[PDB]
Design a binder for this molecule. Structure first.
Ligand code: LTX
Lengths: 216, 211
């Protein structure tokens, strides 16, 4: 099978700047007929992949001129000029000269924006969950930038690592921020063995972590 | 102009499932039709192709699905199909159909195929109320399979909402959603999260009340 390799794996780019994505194929994608069967797809978060450029450089319908493709043989480049917020997502190269058709692993375009501190909210288990025997403590960490963040759960001053389920969003198309949900799930018994619950967020926007807590 | 996939769902390993892909606003009879699947672990994975009546309906398959999957077309119904037999857990993923070398080379919204022995389980829906802006939430726990749909005030409340990607630990999914509104909005006005889990025929409304 033809291997498709993309670099870089992720690409932060400021609004209005140009982005360049590289795709390398293990075999030449030039057919006997003269066409080069290399294509670029974009998959925005929550969406299906969409065709951007077919046969190296041809824009598919509805694709603006700020998107352009180039290259030959086994080396190709997608250039996004004047990057817009709405251009975030994962860019895939693909070949259709040989069966099986194969895809690159994707390159994620991240839009640089001003740093933003996470808005942090913590929630005790609902009465309803408690009745059923479960006890989840939920912490939302919303609209932050850059994406890297670290969340620590503390119970009575002690860090708990087990029972934690975290979910991270993709970058938001509208404001270029990120959000995160952290749930510490205990049983009703374990939760009632303790009173003090703390969600602790480490992010570049603050030298000391953001701390949200409650006492049971 | 659109492509619409259907036929997916939860199916036990060794099982069988038939996907449909129906086109609107154009005729598929003129274009090579492809199935492609997506998973977090493998990314985009080409599955099968069927060419034209004029190509003698020649087909091609990925090696991983040969002998098990069958791609077919019915131009008279403007549709392509994927019959899948002896399904494996690794066949799990979102399945798309697309015309290639075509003005109408769109992928549609896809159909989710879940191949697992795990049983269908309804979600528990728990309201998240606080102990200038106020953040409220809804915890949707212990369901299977995907998907669920979560909205707030039947979708009227869209700004300031974060619905997080479902997380699968073992055989149960957990999802949460948060909504942030001005302190003057709640609890003076109603804020209710609506959760739908078609697979278990579940619809739940949780009004967020103080305390
Ligand atoms: C499932 C995974 C598969 C991976 C991807 C596979 C295939 C590529 C996918 C889609 C191709 C879509 C092509 C659409 C062509 S119509 C099809 C196009 N025909 C042409 O003549 C190409 C255009 C010409 N080379 C040019 O750009 O000047 C073509 O590709 N012909 C076949 C050939 O040249 O060999 C036009 O309708 C574009 C419309 C442009 C517009 O409206 O502005």
């Amino acid at each position: 099978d033809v291997v498709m390799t993309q670099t870089p794996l992720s690409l932060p780019v400021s609004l209005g700047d140009q982005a360049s994505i590289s795709c390398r194929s293990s075999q030449s994608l030039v057919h006997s007929n003269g066409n080069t069967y290399l294509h670029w797809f974009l998959q925005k978060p929550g969406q299906s992949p969409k065709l951007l450029i077919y046969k190296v450089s041809n824009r598919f319908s509805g694709v603006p001129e700020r998107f352009s493709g180039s290259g030959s043989g086994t080396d190709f480049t997608l250039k996004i000029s004047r990057v817009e917020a709405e251009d975030l997502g994962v860019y895939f190269c693909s070949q259709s000269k040989y069966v099986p058709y194969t895809f690159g692993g994707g390159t994620k375009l991240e839009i640089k924006r001003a740093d933003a501190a996470p808005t942090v909210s913590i929630f005790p288990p609902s009465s309803e969950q408690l009745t059923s025997g479960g006890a989840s403590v939920v912490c939302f960490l919303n609209n932050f930038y850059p994406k890297d963040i670290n969340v620590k759960w503390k119970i009575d001053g002690s860090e708990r690592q087990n029972g934690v389920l975290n979910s991270w969003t993709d970058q938001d198309s509208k404001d270029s921020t990120y959000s995160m949900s952290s749930t510490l799930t205990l049983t009703k018994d374990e939760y009632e063995r303790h009173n003090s619950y703390t969600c602790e967020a480490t992010h570049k926007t603050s030298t000391s972590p953001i701390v949200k807590s409650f006492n049971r | 102009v659109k492509l619409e996939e259907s036929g997916g769902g939860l199916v036990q390993p060794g099982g069988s499932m038939k996907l449909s892909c129906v086109a609107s606003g154009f005729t598929i009879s003129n274009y090579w039709m492809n199935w492609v699947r997506q998973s977090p672990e493998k990314g985009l994975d080409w599955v099968a192709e069927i060419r034209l009546k004029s190509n003698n309906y020649v087909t091609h398959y990925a090696e991983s699905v040969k002998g098990r999957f069958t791609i077919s077309r019915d131009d008279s119904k403007n549709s392509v199909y994927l019959q899948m037999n002896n399904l494996r857990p690794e066949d799990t993923g979102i399945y798309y159909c697309t015309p290639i070398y075509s003005p109408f080379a769109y992928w549609g919204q896809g159909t989710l195929v879940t191949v697992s022995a795990a049983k269908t389980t309804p979600p528990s829906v728990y309201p998240l109320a606080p102990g200038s802006m106020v953040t409220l939430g809804c915890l949707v726990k212990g369901y299977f399979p995907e998907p669920v749909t979560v909205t707030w005030n039947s979708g009227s409340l869209s700004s300031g909402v974060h619905t997080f990607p479902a997380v699968l630990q073992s055989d149960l999914y957990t999802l949460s959603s948060s909504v942030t509104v001005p302190s003057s909005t709640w609890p003076s006005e109603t804020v209710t999260c609506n959760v739908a889990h078609p697979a278990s025929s579940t619809k739940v409304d949780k009004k967020i009340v103080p305390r």
